[PDB]
């Protein structure tokens, strides 16, 4: 699998270098591509780069402003994004492009959100949503984490470092009238377990390079 990093907040007219590491295969001997998807909107190709040398092709939207490259060592694909404006606000995926018969991308990365906006990065304030024996109990007790007043998107939440997945829903974020985001992540657990089991939510905010491990205890 491919994995992208760099995604975060940049001001109008600002610059950002996105990274994409290949955990298995090499980047130097495969045609690599960047695709972006603006919130609400569909897929849009950005750039492509062939194996031999750093001679890249760019979409009409990004030509000049964007520069694709790869560090020939340690399978690293870069995308230098310069002179950014609001229209460039999107999730950016690195991927392998097959260009023998048809042009298509068969390997995709998870993606990383780039946000172009005149505002400041803010790390989240994480608060525990403690389980009770009333509103947080419907046959099985429910507990969570409140991830409040952060910018920009995204944040991701696992539980007990991914050891807890069944019962987990991480809800969508909402942009508050303050221009800051809130989201929650609950897990439903049998009421009997509460006492014994230890609950840590692993809140990840890559845009501010912040990770909060919050202990949710029975109140």
């Amino acid at each position: 699998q491919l994995l992208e990093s760099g995604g975060g907040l940049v001001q109008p007219g600002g610059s950002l270098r996105l990274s994409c590491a290949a955990s298995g295969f090499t980047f130097r001997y495969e045609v690599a591509a960047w695709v972006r998807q603006a919130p609400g909107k569909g897929l849009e190709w950005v750039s492509a780069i062939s194996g031999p040398a750093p001679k890249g092709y760019y979409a009409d939207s990004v030509k000049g402003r964007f520069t694709i490259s790869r560090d020939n060592s340690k399978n690293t694909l870069y995308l230098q994004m310069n002179s950014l404006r609001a229209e460039d606000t999107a999730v950016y995926y690195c991927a392998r492009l097959r260009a023998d018969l048809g042009l298509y991308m068969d390997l995709w990365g998870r993606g990383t959100l780039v946000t172009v906006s005149s505002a400041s990065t803010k790390g989240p304030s994480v608060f525990p949503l403690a389980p009770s024996s009333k509103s947080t109990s419907g046959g099985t007790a429910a507990l969570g984490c409140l991830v409040k007043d952060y910018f920009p998107e995204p944040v991701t939440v696992s539980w007990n470092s991914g050891a807890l997945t069944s019962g987990v829903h991480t809800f969508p974020a909402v942009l508050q009238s303050s221009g800051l985001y809130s989201l929650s992540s609950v897990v439903t657990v049998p009421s009997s377990s509460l006492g014994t089991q230890t609950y840590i939510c692993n809140v990840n905010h890559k845009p501010s390079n912040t990770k909060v491990d919050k202990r949710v205890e029975p109140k």
Partner: protein, 212 residues
């Protein structure tokens, strides 16, 4: 320069087709590829070189090309097929890889589900930091149309109310969140606060008190 219908609809076990319409400069000449994007996930290759199924894709999925129109075929429709579907090819007029606008595929006749509502009061930590957020979380409901109202001693409260768009879960049910931001004083001032979740005529109201 690729065009799909924004939405497609059919019932479980039925055959649904998503047309991708173009010109001779793209579909007519070049090889088409389809992509499947499930909610929150990255796009996944469905079909490459017009007809060939990607790894793990069942034969239920088929790729066609009749003139300037590429047809994605889905037989024996299952709820797990609910996704956004994108056609991709090369357009000759331009010098770039193109995508269709995308087609949202809804599976009809899914069972109605009453929402599970959980209301958490402000945590100790937040009140120590001189803030109060009531967190109302709504899960496992269908269809995706819910409204969240807030009461303070059975009086409607509008200030501080922030509600998420209801979003599809991994199991095709919908999830929403609502937040009532308060000062620690406003929280402790009132006897109770209530999260009123309305779904398909019926209302689930959960209450929390500052005097637990």
């Amino acid at each position: 320069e690729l065009t799909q219908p924004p939405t497609a609809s059919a019932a479980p076990g039925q055959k649904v087709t998503i047309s991708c319409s173009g010109s001779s400069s793209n579909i007519g000449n070049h090889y088409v590829s389809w992509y499947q994007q499930l909610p929150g996930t990255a796009p996944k290759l469905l079909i490459y070189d017009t007809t060939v199924l990607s790894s793990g894709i069942p034969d239920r999925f088929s790729g066609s090309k009749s003139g300037t129109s590429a047809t994605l075929g889905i037989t024996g429709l299952q709820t797990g097929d609910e996704a956004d579907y994108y056609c991709g090819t090369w357009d000759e007029l331009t010098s770039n890889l193109v995508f269709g606008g995308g087609t949202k595929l809804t599976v009809l006749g899914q069972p109605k589900a009453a929402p599970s509502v959980t209301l958490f009061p402000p945590s100790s930590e937040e009140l120590q930091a001189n803030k109060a957020t009531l967190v109302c979380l709504i899960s496992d409901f269908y269809p995706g149309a819910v409204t969240v109202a807030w009461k303070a001693d059975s009086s409607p409260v509008k200030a501080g109310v922030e509600t998420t768009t209801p979003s599809k879960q991994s199991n095709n049910k919908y999830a929403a969140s609502s937040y009532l931001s308060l000062t620690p004083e406003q929280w402790k001032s009132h006897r109770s606060y209530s999260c009123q979740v309305t779904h398909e005529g019926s209302t689930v109201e959960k209450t929390v008190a500052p005097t637990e």
